[PDB]
Assembly symmetry: D2
Homo-oligomer: 237 residues x 4
């Protein structure tokens, strides 16, 4: 059904579906079983920043995640996205909770896509930046439990009044406009995404994670993708 | 019905509805009878560039139109757009032909909107740039006769095979995503639009013009707005 | 000697040289006696953000200053900068202390200048953004007491070890590259500057202020411009 | 003496110093003998566009060169620039002619450098874009025979009145401000450069080429680097 390319900030180690034994960042190409992962020293309650970059010349999707005053984690994977995704895609953020939970709060999100064609000076670009989300954010498609406006933030999963994260929740936010990532006369296509997040859990084992993803434009949350599936995959294959 | 704020590049002088006796650029606030105009030395067959700028501190909508090697024309009008438009709008380009005609070709179009809130570093921004239009431009809403892809250009009004402009045509192209132009904690909201166009007519009296407009998100072409109404207004009041 | 256009965030009311009886933001065109001012509810110890904008079509220099959770202050003045400044200028930040003092800390500073010429697609642009200053910031010209690197910030005036602001201090930081603000074939020239600051004083009467300024490229601090002259003017005329 | 990293658009095959037997694009790390090259179908008299990209996560310097209506050439090389260049560098364009010659005209040049630190939202950026060069371009350091302003272009090597390219010429243009390409708390540093050029020769064997380069800030043209050395290297080792 959906084609998903995602960079996951996986807070819970589901070693039975291939997660390493620690929080990790991973690159998922059409499967929750990451093609590549890197240990991530996740800090409960701290605001982190994730940067994702890719260009069609190098064909390497790379991500860097850091927290202030801490060393960063980085993961890269060689993948030609022209062979995985459609030429028009939607980009978004997804997060879930299962039996274990955490807040999956997004405080800001920026994205820049550029397609440079062979005509002298031909650049097609799309750029958006959100440093605040309003209750009626018309340029975002919110799916599942995702809501905007509480403290001007984007809450991907359900958080009750007293700020408590709820389990078995899943939510996604996609930018409204389709994004053009391939065009026949493009000599270089590239994108960069950055988002700051705040994962906080009352528990010692937060779950399940946040993911930046690119999908077919009409992507919707797969049935039963709460928990370990991060609101992105229908199963764990 | 629709709320329209537009900068018109009016090629035909309809002196009966208030046009001056020459091609002119004008600022239209909810009426085709421009609030302010400036003589425009339109060059048939040449690529021109229009720049439109506005910010909520000064509340002055200004536009500059020029052709290479020629002096520019500029028009400005003091208007608080927060009092005219909704907080979420769609931006687009419109053009029409009537008994007289011309090609209303758009070769590139860029737009940048910024909302800076009172939180330190809070900037919400939207930027798009098209230097080429493809046959299936999914991020544009084409209305009426507007088509994309012929020579990688956006043809707002009908042009037959042999490149001839057709009369009684009207077409509009709006960027897919809603644009947020006001927010309660924004200290300064601004936008700038730039587009290059090519108006060419076999006739000595081209008509009717191209307009950059901002409207309510659900705006559609008014019935009978071909010709002098530029695909923007239902009547000439 | 120097030609100075500045937006002052004046913390001390020197009513004898024309200041209003309160902290105020003002637009200074070649004189410390502001052409226009607006009351500024300055917050000692809080990080504020100032936005300055200008374009050659409207010829209005406007500035907005705000603090989180507080209403902003704005001041505007109609001035054609082509008639005041040279075509090549340097942009900077200046601050001073006199008998009264305060820290004049800059935490981030961004600037964007654009010159759009009448050739189709001719845009000359300069943009810089500093969200951190290093001890050896080679792209900034530091004058007087200005230093970079302490807490990754730019300290315009002297602050001793224990964080205490020192009196009779003056310092300026200018971006290294000259900025082109006028060109003969430019149809619209514009700029926007934004900087966040932290003015903190142990005293009830902080002084003297911070100013964003544009000057001739070879501008240097005028002798005796500590205190009320903000490191910009040689006298109070 | 100087540390040079350059992307060369080499028009003349000096097979004795390792050039392939055809025009080629190459990546030169401290030597004119390119670490990697790719055949380049150079078009005499046509305006081409070169794009150079690099980021510190992937550590791969890649370049794409194209002409309208033609397939592009691309070359990439894995190199960690933090191990080759200083943290502060100057970026520029260089070109030369020897016994054979060609015009080495630059019509536009843009550059964007970004350093993203681990503090949430810490981005330091520098961006410049020139779509026109004036006779007194104060923000460019012209070395050797390089001149600005003729037809609003940048002529890297000497061209006599009648538009004829002169042999044994060498010229370079560097952006005035130093560029910061590494910082201790940066999690990702990246840059992208784009320039359009017009290489035209009356002869069947144009020479010698144009190069985009990054060097130590105080770099100057090496003595005798006309011809095959592209105004970048003192010898052919
Ligand atoms: Ca997991
Ligand atoms: Ca008319
Ligand atoms: Ca004062
Ligand atoms: Ca060679
Ligand atoms: Co995982
Ligand atoms: Co009219
Ligand atoms: Co004052
Ligand atoms: Co070579």
């Amino acid at each position: 059904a959906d084609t998903i390319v995602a960079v996951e900030l996986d807070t819970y180690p589901n070693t039975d579906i291939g997660d390493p034994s620690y929080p990790h960042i991973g690159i998922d190409i059409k499967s929750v079983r990451s093609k590549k992962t890197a240990k991530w020293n996740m800090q409960n309650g701290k605001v982190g920043t994730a940067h994702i970059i890719y260009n069609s010349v190098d064909k390497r999707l790379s991500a860097v995640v850091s927290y202030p005053n801490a060393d960063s984690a980085t993961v890269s994977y060689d993948v030609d996205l022209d062979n995985v995704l459609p030429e028009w895609v939607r980009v978004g953020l997804s997060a879930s909770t299962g039996l274990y939970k955490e807040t999956n709060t997004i405080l800001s999100w920026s994205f820049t896509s550029k397609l440079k064609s062979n005509s002298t000076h031909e650049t097609n670009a799309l750029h958006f930046m959100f440093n605040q989300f309003s209750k009626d954010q018309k340029d975002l498609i919110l799916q599942g439990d995702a809501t905007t406006g509480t403290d001007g933030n984007l809450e991907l999963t359900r958080v009750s009044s007293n700020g408590s994260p709820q389990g078995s929740s899943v939510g996604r936010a996609l930018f409204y406009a389709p994004v053009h990532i391939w065009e026949s006369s493009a000599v270089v296509a590239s994108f960069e995404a950055t988002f700051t997040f705040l994962i906080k859990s009352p528990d010692s084992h937060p779950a399940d994670g946040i993911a930046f993803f690119i999908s077919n434009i009409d992507s919707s949350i797969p049935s039963g993708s709460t928990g370990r599936l991060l609101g992105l995959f229908p199963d764990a294959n």
